Design a protein around this ligand. Structure first.
Ligand SMILES: Nc1ncnc2c1ncn2[C@@H]1O[C@H](COP(=O)(O)OP(=O)(O)OP(=O)(O)O)[C@@H](O)[C@H]1O
Ligand SMILES: Nc1ncnc2c1ncn2[C@@H]1O[C@H](COP(=O)(O)OP(=O)(O)OP(=O)(O)O)[C@@H](O)[C@H]1O
Ligand SMILES: Nc1ncnc2c1ncn2[C@@H]1O[C@H](COP(=O)(O)OP(=O)(O)OP(=O)(O)O)[C@@H](O)[C@H]1O
Ligand SMILES: Nc1ncnc2c1ncn2[C@@H]1O[C@H](COP(=O)(O)OP(=O)(O)O)[C@@H](O)[C@H]1O
Ligand SMILES: Nc1ncnc2c1ncn2[C@@H]1O[C@H](COP(=O)(O)OP(=O)(O)O)[C@@H](O)[C@H]1O
Ligand SMILES: Nc1ncnc2c1ncn2[C@@H]1O[C@H](COP(=O)(O)OP(=O)(O)O)[C@@H](O)[C@H]1O
Lengths: 257, 272, 12, 273, 271, 272, 242, 258
């Protein structure tokens, strides 16, 4: 909760949103005086979204370690939609935990089936799903403008979520995330396949040339399949061509649907 | 459990309260009740009995009624059923509703059942690309086997009724399941209308000082249900003038009342 | 409970 | 279901025929047919009639048919139900149609009682050979109605009336007489037929001036049968806006002229025979 | 307790040299499974997790099952044969709880894994779920989708499955965090087909020697499995004999026959 | 101990045999080729060590001679036989369908050897699905596997199914294959010589007739079915029964044949 | 669609142009073929898909197709489109011979018929040539052997051997194994037993199906006799004895 | 808050016209209720999002005060619902004790289902409950200064129940603004933050194109931030230029030939 331990050096990628997520995490927290002369406390609370596993999670995690920030692990549909009694009762206890706590952040995920669609008045319906949703909306604007706490949400799909609760003043922003260019594809072999038995002096862009539009976390599997062939040789250590044989298996060997 | 009807009610009509279609008033007889009554005479020759039939035609023409007098004259067990209730909210309620009716027939046999309309649940293709419209086909398949699968019954068979006779599968329309089909056309032939007017008219009050051939030959392209309306409306051409028994000009005042709407629908701007 | 799932419906 | 146990709201309440104009003969064509079985049924047995079963209306909308659909309630004192031909469908097949059996029986358990049914063009199709995966559902929903009024199940001492703004597209098998034994068209009337309808509103509210109709109604060759209740109130709507709470024939003119062109910009769409 | 009869312990028959002669994938499970547990330190020599899971592509009547029949002895360890139809219940929560327990025995059966088939009952990327019922079916997915990956420390397990068509059905559940890879079967090559069938009839007469090498051809895209049918259709044709006697023409009469039912296209444009 | 209830379908044969199934003698010859092997020299292919064939499909147009074989074959069984009629879609409590089928074999496993039967799984047959359709497709998904990879070492061991349908070209290709099936055999309409037999055989019990050559009727009548001809064999009696001469004639066959299709009947030959 | 640039014009977001890769995705459904150049000879080969012994054997419209004494053409896939390229090539031959007073090269020929297709896919109201072809033969008074392969996108690329159409990838790997830029086959019969042998994987020993020519210096063109072929079809199979 | 009537622009034309349709519901029963003539019992109306209809709605309650509780159909969508449909019917006799307070429903009815058939899912309980709460209700010309109502996205899609169009049909499409309007709106959203006055919105007023009212609130809230994105206490006013296009971001990536 108090340390994710994941850095900017952990992240290659597009990287650019983080200096924009370096906006509201600091000046409310450190220095509104830069903007006190014009519209003090001008930011109020933001959101994230992107396709699955584009570092949308890892991004905010990349900064909770910074600022001595202290976030949560009771997240999304996992631990509050399934074993359930008086979800807001935890939230009252949550803010009761958080009412005076400092250098801490809310954040959670999975919110498609949580508060994204309102059931369209079907599928059997659920009320506790909403009350604990609204119970936040009660606790939301308690002291956040004059206070110091922040708020961050996440989605695989923002417009798939609920736009009903988007009454501004309650909400500020939703920032996007997509796949990176080759350079974001470049500095990730510098960490992913780093931690492996591999030869040195190896150019790691030709693979980047030859893996177009694609997210990051699969490269972990490309690494997982990369280190598979000195094996297959009963040899020891990774070449670069081993990637090329692997990239053949996994992109055009995957695009078939 | 599905139902059955005896003498709580009946349709309260007769062969004599109907007329015309006389060749159909005997083909139906030999299939249904004569086998039920007079059995040995053809079991002298022991051929398998003909069985339940179909009967189609344009809307009306007694496609639904002819049952009603023979129903009154059944001397066997009988129903009051149509087609578009076999469906149910759940899935297996439908087929489960219908397996037992033959058991109900067989539990009460010899007897026969009926449908007023079927074309909803009988089509050519047994369409495939929807979770719904197969579950109707299952209602089709099940009778299609319960009709003439293994060891069906002594009974005669599910009597159809439609407004149309092409939409539906040949697998149902073939011997052993629908050994007779019947047409009910009107055509306005003069051999019969000169009765059935009189049939409908003789039952009802009528002035014996009045024309009747003022319209028969005068009109030649007619149906069977509408005609009740004119000699229904003929009475209503009277009481509006608080008349207590009809007059001759009522029919002439009625002739174009029900029929004469020949053609005015966008004549010039039809095709040209 | 005293039941389980089963249903059917149109699509459009 | 309980939904059948909800529709019935004003089964009796009398809003009589004096509050209507233009239709002194249609009602002569209709007071004839309905009430007589339900007043003096032995006449049709005095004379030998298979009595009627079924009527409808047609003509463009906003015209006064629904008033007639209820104005008969005043004459009878007997029962009535209101219901559309739209709020029937749902997901679960048959549930839409089962209701139809639920209700005609519900008529039989308390009568004299009859039925109304709006906007039947939704249930007013020609049974197609080809179809979608689902549009045939309403067709199988329909024919229950096609059955029950004249089906093997005999019927008596109840009545149905329906209405559209689109007589075409209908399955002729419905239009078989016996399923309904007389038709009628309610048109936009003539000026005088449009003139009783004009004054009934003045007949209630505080009139002040003389007639001043025949030239006002010279503009009345455009209206429908129902935009005038708007017009009637619209005069006092701003006769008063000058805080002049005693109306005049001075101010309606600004209204009745006004309505015509705001009505024009999306009017005269179709007429349906 | 509930799954003791579901708990397989059978010792089936099938093996290599009972295989028909695939080679190009016989290894890659031993990659997936064997080299992991045979010598998992090499994972550490590479510094990795040796992989998890596998799905089979659409190869209906190709051998999409038989490797499960293969491994059953070469496996040299415990195993399960589960299948998706069993999962579903006359009651509501009694199903998904099953998945939570059956891994414990799998925990108890440490060097034990499973084959699954028929998962097309489950893998479905359309969850409007108008009812209350199939919401459970979604609930039948979640806990398992959870129980799979919610389990870490797969030092020993290999939770794998297979089907006949995926490209329009299964979710976007795929993630190396959950499922790694996916390996394909499909129709064979000629020399692939050549390995198949004398080995079958190796346990059979061949009264006479009938140069099967010219019997078949790559142009006729046979199934992989109309050929044991071929091998027995002819003895059927000797079942249309008193002679228990082998003949080439019998095979000739068979492929002419069975392909009379099989499809054929128009060479209209001579394309 | 004793088995589940819904398997009452294990039951005795109806009245039928291989005299009343004429014409298609080579077909029926095949359908015991799958039967005589494991029984009459089971060790033919077993001690030759060849392979063990298993169940089959037989299709064709409606009313061609499928079902009577499927029942009459049981008459000459020396084994055990069962029945279905589409009841496998008892789909409320969805899993019960899967329960229903897994029980269906283990019982037969208890009672094996036992050939078994299906009819019109055209209902169950397809898999192409995008947004709706499930709730039965499980039950095809399971039986397909119920024969393979869990019991497959002995699943189709000694149980020897068959299957009878129409429209083989709409359901899955998964099912027809050599896996789970052997011979997509086929019932066409008859030949001129076939139809004589099939007309001669429902003609048995009629009367002490005379003055007949009952084949030229077949020359009056093209390929229609070897199933409907009982139809024209039927009303020939009725037409004479209609006039009480229990004795019969060729004249009526000339009539009744024309009764059926001349009424069951477009010059736009733009083609050559 | 006079003009209209229907979808031939519409590039892809990937970059490709749909109807072209579609074309030679269709070409592989047709009869294979093959070419080889050895030391002094050049060789070609095709097949006849199996008929019912009715496909008229005498005057079949074949795959080899002359241009002059010293050039031929073989192709693959579509056929109605093949017949015009064969025409508006040899047209230019009789023309080139005339207005330059000397015959064609081959590096003049493949440029044309590989450039023509580009106009039938960079114009309006035109479908491409759903076909792929190759050229073969010598230049005048020169021992050098040449064959050029060309395909509907409009590119021509020389070779030493190559195959087009159906199951080529089942074949060409056999040829890269045996054939080598090291060292040709010696002479005619060497190329052929090497040539034919490579087919056999898709052949079901239909010697009738396959038809062959050669090409030699001084334009000694010829097609060969089924007996001369079949007596290679067998002795090569006599070598199978292991 | 108790913001003014306007807060929106210079739209005196609608509002000074509109509530004339609400004076009689508000008051004037002396001869109105002595004339007994028609009374729109909740001026339900329309206009897709982008407008200040909520503001025109709520600011009209600046004169007819109304407690801040206004709950919508997404409160009426739960499991085995009807207690929510109980709530709505009790909602007015509740408020009918003593209040000109009037809540504001909001309806995107088929924003969850399709409309391939015009015969539509006019939602279950709203279509039912809206009747009784509308049929059996008067305002007494005092302590009922307005009449509770709602609004929707598009007036083409509804199954008009009894009196759904009988009397309650007072309705206007809010005409989207023009350049004389617009520049004075965005002025409002900078009343709390001042900047370099070198370029007025009147300078911008010709540069606008296809801008509805709500999203214009997404202009200075960012462009006020895009200045202090570079920490200038003196707010610049060209950050609007490169921020207005952030409505959709333009995918501006290295214009090659342009
Ligand atoms: N030939 C006739 N003899 C006596 N009455 C007739 C005749 N033709 C029509 N009718 C009258 O017209 C009505 C015809 O009803 P009918 O049985 O034709 O319903 P239907 O329209 O055929 O039913 P469906 O629409 O299901 O086919 C009867 O009520 C009967 O009074
Ligand atoms: N190369 C081969 N080696 C071994 N068996 C083969 C080979 N080719 C075909 N077969 C045959 O193919 C059949 C297996 O088909 P396949 O495994 O694809 O279906 P299945 O997996 O049993 O189907 P399901 O698992 O869905 O029930 C077996 O009967 C087997 O004899
Ligand atoms: N060769 C024959 N000999 C005697 N009767 C025959 C013969 N062929 C067909 N029939 C007749 O045809 C009927 C059987 O029809 P068949 O079984 O072909 O259709 P079905 O299978 O019932 O329909 P479905 O295919 O939809 O199940 C029996 O009544 C039988 O008398
Ligand atoms: N630029 C990057 N640097 C490091 N890891 C990355 C990068 N881009 C993607 N990833 C990978 O993407 C994954 C993000 O997972 P996560 O965001 O939690 O999934 P989801 O987006 O579905 O919640 C991580 O496993 C991480 O390794
Ligand atoms: N003839 C009429 N007399 C009085 N009011 C009428 C008349 N015609 C229409 N109206 C007005 O139309 C409204 C409803 O009429 P209705 O019967 O529903 O016609 P429609 O069905 O065409 O809408 C009422 O407000 C009523 O005042
Ligand atoms: N003409 C306008 N002038 C000022 N603000 C406006 C205008 N139109 C919309 N807005 C802004 O939009 C919001 C009000 O929109 P609202 O009426 O609630 O529309 P919706 O009901 O569709 O959300 C407020 O934040 C307001 O500042």
């Amino acid at each position: 909760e108090e340390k994710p331990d994941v850095t900017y050096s952990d992240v290659g990628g597009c990287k650019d949103q983080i200096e924009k997520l370096r906006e509201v995490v600091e000046l409310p927290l450190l220095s509104p005086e830069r903007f006190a002369t014009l519209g003090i406390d001008p930011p109020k609370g933001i959101l994230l979204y992107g396709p699955p596993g584009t570092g949308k999670t890892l991004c905010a995690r990349a900064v909770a370690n910074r600022t001595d920030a202290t976030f949560i692990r009771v997240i999304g549909s996992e631990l509050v939609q399934k074993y359930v009694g008086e979800g807001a009762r935890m939230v009252r206890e949550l803010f009761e935990m958080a009412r005076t706590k400092k250098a801490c952040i809310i954040f959670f995920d999975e919110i498609d089936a949580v508060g994204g669609a309102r059931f369209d008045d079907g599928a059997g319906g659920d009320n506790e799903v909403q009350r604990t949703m609204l119970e936040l909306i009660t606790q939301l604007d308690g002291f956040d403008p004059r206070g110091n706490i922040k708020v961050m949400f996440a989605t695989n799909r923002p417009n798939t979520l609920d736009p009903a609760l988007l009454r501004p003043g309650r909400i500020d922003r939703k920032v996007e995330f997509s796949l990176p260019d080759l350079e974001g594809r470049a500095n990730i072999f510098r960490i992913h396949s780093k931690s492996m038995s591999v030869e040195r002096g190896i150019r790691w862009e030709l693979i980047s040339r030859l893996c177009p539009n694609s997210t990051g976390a699969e490269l972990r599997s490309v690494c997982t399949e990369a280190g598979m062939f000195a094996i297959r040789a009963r040899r020891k250590v990774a070449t670069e061509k081993d990637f090329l044989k692997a990239v053949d298996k996994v992109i055009s060997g995957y695009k078939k649907f | 459990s599905i139902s059955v009807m005896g003498e709580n009610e009946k349709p309260d009509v007769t062969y004599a309260d109907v007329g015309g279609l006389d060749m159909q008033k005997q083909e139906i007889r030999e299939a249904v009740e004569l086998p039920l009554v007079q059995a040995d005479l053809y079991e002298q020759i022991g051929i398998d009995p003909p069985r339940g039939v179909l009967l189609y035609g344009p809307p009306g023409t007694g496609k639904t009624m002819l049952v009603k007098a023979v129903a009154n004259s059944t001397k066997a067990a009988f129903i009051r059923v149509n087609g578009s209730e076999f469906v149910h909210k759940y899935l297996g309620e439908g087929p489960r509703m219908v397996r037992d009716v033959f058991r109900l027939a067989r539990e009460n046999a010899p007897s026969i059942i009926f449908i007023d309309e079927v074309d909803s649940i009988a089509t050519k293709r047994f369409d495939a690309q929807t979770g719904s419209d197969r579950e109707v086909q299952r209602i089709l398949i099940e009778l299609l086997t319960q009709m003439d699968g293994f060891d069906q019954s002594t009974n005669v068979k599910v009597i159809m009724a439609t407004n149309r006779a092409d939409t539906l599968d040949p697998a149902l329309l073939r011997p052993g399941r629908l050994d007779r089909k019947i047409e009910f056309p009107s055509l306005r032939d003069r051999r019969e209308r000169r009765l059935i007017f009189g049939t409908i008219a003789s039952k009802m009050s009528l002035a014996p000082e009045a024309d009747l051939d003022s319209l028969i030959i005068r009109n030649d392209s007619l149906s069977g249900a509408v005609i009740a309306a004119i000699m229904q409306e003929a009475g209503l051409r009277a009481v509006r003038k608080n008349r207590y028994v009809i007059l001759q000009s009522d029919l002439e005042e009625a002739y174009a009342t029900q029929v004469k709407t020949d053609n005015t629908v966008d004549k010039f701007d039809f095709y040209k | 409970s005293a039941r389980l799932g089963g249903a059917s419906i149109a699509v459009q | 279901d309980p939904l059948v146990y909800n529709m019935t709201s004003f089964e009796q309440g009398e809003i009589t025929f004096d509050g209507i104009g233009g239709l002194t003969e249609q009602i002569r064509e209709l007071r004839e047919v309905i009430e007589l079985p339900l007043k003096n049924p032995e006449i049709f047995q005095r004379v030998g009639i298979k009595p009627p079963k079924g009527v409808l209306l047609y003509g463009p909308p906003g015209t006064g048919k629904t008033l007639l659909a209820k104005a008969v309630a005043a004459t009878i004192g007997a029962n009535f139900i209101f219901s559309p031909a739209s709020g029937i469908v749902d997901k679960y097949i048959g549930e839409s149609a089962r209701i139809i059996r639920e209700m005609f029986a519900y008529a039989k358990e308390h009568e004299p009682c009859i039925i109304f049914m709006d906007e039947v063009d939704a249930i007013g199709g020609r049974r197609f050979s080809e179809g979608t995966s689902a549009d045939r559902e309403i067709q199988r929903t329909l024919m229950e109605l096609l059955t029950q009024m004249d089906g093997f199940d005999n019927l008596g001492q109840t009545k149905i009336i329906m209405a559209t703004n689109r007589p075409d597209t209908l399955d002729p098998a419905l239009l078989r007489p016996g399923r309904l034994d007389r038709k009628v068209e309610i048109p936009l009337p003539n000026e005088a037929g449009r003139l009783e309808i004009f004054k009934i509103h003045t007949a209630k509210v505080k009139k002040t001036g003389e007639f001043d109709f025949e030239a006002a109604v010279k503009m009345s060759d455009g209206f429908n049968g129902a935009d005038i209740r708007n017009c009637a109130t619209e005069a006092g709507f701003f006769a008063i806006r000058d805080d002049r709470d005693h109306i005049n024939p001075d101010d309606l003119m600004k209204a009745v002229r006004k309505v015509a062109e705001v009505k024009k910009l999306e009017g005269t769409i179709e007429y349906q025979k | 307790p509930m799954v003791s009869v579901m708990k397989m312990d059978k010792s089936p028959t099938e093996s290599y040299s009972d295989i028909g002669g695939l080679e190009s994938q016989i290894q890659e499970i031993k990659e997936s499974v064997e080299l992991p547990l045979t010598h998992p330190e090499l994972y550490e020599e590479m510094g990795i997790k040796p992989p998890k899971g596998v799905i089979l592509y659409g190869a209906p009547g190709t051998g999409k099952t038989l490797l499960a029949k293969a491994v059953a002895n070469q496996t040299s360890a415990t195993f399960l044969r589960i299948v998706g139809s069993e999962l579903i219940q006359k009651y509501l929560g009694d199903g998904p709880r099953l998945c939570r327990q059956i891994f414990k025995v799998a925990g108890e059966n440490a060097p034990s894994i499973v084959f699954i088939d028929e998962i097309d009952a489950i893998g479905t990327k359309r969850y409007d779920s108008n009812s209350g019922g199939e919401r459970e079916i979604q609930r039948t997915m979640l806990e398992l989708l959870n129980q799979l990956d919610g389990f870490d420390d797969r030092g020993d397990v290999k939770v794998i499955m297979a089907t006949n068509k995926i490209e329009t059905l299964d979710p976007a559940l795929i993630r190396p965090g959950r499922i790694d890879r996916k390996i394909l079967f499909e129709n064979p090559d000629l020399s692939t087909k050549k390995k198949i069938l004398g080995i079958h009839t190796s346990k059979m007469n061949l009264s006479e020697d009938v140069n099967l090498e010219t019997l078949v051809t790559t142009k006729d895209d046979l199934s992989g499995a109309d050929i044991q049918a071929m091998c027995t259709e002819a003895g059927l044709l000797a079942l249309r004999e008193r002679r228990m006697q082998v003949t080439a023409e019998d095979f000739k009469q068979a492929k002419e026959r069975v392909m009379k039912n099989k499809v054929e296209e128009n060479l209209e444009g001579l394309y | 101990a004793d088995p589940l209830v819904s398997l009452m379908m294990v039951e005795k044969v109806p009245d039928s045999t291989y005299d009343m199934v004429g014409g298609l003698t080579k077909q029926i010859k095949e359908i015991k080729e799958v039967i005589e092997l494991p029984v009459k020299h089971p060790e033919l292919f077993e001690s030759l060590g060849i392979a063990q064939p298993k169940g089959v499909i037989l299709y064709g147009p409606p009313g061609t001679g499928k079902t009577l074989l499927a029942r009459a074959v049981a008459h000459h069984t020396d084994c055990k036989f069962i029945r279905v009629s589409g009841a496998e879609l008892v789909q409320k409590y969805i899993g019960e369908g899967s329960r229903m089928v897994r029980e269906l074999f283990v019982m037969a496993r208890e009672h094996a050897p036992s050939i078994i039967f299906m009819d019109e799984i055209d209902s169950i047959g397809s898999t192409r699905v995008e947004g709706s359709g499930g709730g039965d497709s499980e039950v095809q998904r399971t039986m397909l596997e119920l024969l393979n990879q869990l019991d497959g070492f002995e699943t189709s061991k000694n149980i020897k199914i068959i299957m009878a349908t129409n429209r083989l070209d709409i359901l899955d290709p998964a099912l027809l294959r050599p896996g789970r099936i052997d011979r997509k055999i086929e019932f066409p309409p008859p030949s001129v010589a076939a139809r004589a037999e099939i007309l001669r055989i429902h003609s048995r019990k009629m009367n002490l007739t005379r003055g007949i050559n009952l084949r030229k009727v077949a020359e009056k009548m093209n390929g229609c079915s070897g199933a409907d001809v009982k139809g024209v064999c039927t009303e020939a009696g009725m037409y004479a029964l209609r006039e009480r001469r229990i004795h019969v004639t060729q004249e009526d066959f000339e009539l009744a044949v024309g009764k059926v299709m001349n009424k069951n009947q477009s010059v736009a030959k733009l083609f050559k | 669609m006079s003009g209209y640039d229907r979808a031939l014009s519409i590039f892809s977001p990937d970059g490709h142009i749909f109807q072209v890769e579609y074309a030679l995705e269709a070409v592989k459904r047709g009869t294979c073929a093959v070419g080889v150049k050895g030391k002094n000879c050049v060789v070609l080969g095709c097949e006849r898909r199996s008929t019912l012994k009715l496909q008229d054997t005498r005057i079949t419209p074949s795959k080899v197709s002359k241009i002059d004494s010293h050039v031929v053409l073989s192709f693959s896939g579509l056929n109605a489109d093949s017949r015009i390229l064969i025409e508006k090539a040899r047209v230019e031959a009789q023309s080139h011979r005339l207005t330059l007073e000397d015959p064609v090269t081959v590096e003049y020929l493949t440029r044309y018929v590989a450039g023509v297709q580009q106009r039938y896919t960079q114009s309006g109201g035109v479908r491409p040539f759903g076909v792929s072809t190759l050229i073969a033969g010598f230049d005048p008074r020169d021992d050098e052997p040449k064959l050029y392969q060309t395909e509907p996108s409009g590119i021509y690329s020389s070779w030493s051997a190559q195959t087009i159409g159906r199951n080529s990838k089942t074949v060409r790997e056999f040829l890269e194994k045996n054939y080598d830029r090291k060292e040709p086959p010696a002479t005619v019969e060497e190329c052929v037993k090497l040539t034919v042998r490579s087919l056999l994987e898709v052949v079901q020993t239909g010697a009738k199906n396959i038809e062959i020519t050669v090409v030699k210096p001084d334009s000694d063109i010829v097609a060969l006799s089924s007996e001369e072929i079949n007596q290679y079809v067998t002795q090569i199979e006599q070598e199978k004895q292991e | 808050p108790t913001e003014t009537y306007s807060d929106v622009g210079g739209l005196d034309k609608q509002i000074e016209e509109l509530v004339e349709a609400i004076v009689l519901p508000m008051k004037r029963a002396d001869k109105f209720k002595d004339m007994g003539i028609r009374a729109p019992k909740g001026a339900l109306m329309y206009g897709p999002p982008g407008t200040g209809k909520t503001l025109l709605a709520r600011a009209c309650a600046a004169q007819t005060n109304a407690t801040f509780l206004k709950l919508a159909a997404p409160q009426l969508v739960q499991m085995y619902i009807g207690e929510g449909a109980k709530l709505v019917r009790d909602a007015f006799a509740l408020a009918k004790e003593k209040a000109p307070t009037i809540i504001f429903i909001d309806e995107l009815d088929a924003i969850g289902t399709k409309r391939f058939d015009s015969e539509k899912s006019g939602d279950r309980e709203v279509q039912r409950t809206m009747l009784e709460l509308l049929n059996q209700l008067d305002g007494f010309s005092s302590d009922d200064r307005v009449k509770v109502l709602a609004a929707t996205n598009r007036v083409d899609v509804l199954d008009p129940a009894l009196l759904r169009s009988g009397r309650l049909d007072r309705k206007i499409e809010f005409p989207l603004p023009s350049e004389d309007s617009r520049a004075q709106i965005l002025q409002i959203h900078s009343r709390k933050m001042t900047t370099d006055d070198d370029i007025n919105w009147q300078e911008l007023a010709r540069s606008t194109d296809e801008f509805n009212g709500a999203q214009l609130k997404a202009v200075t809230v960012e462009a006020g931030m895009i200045a202090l994105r570079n920490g200038q206490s003196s707010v610049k006013h060209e950050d609007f230029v490169e921020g207005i296009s952030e409505v959709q971001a333009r995918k501006s990536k290295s214009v090659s030939f342009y």
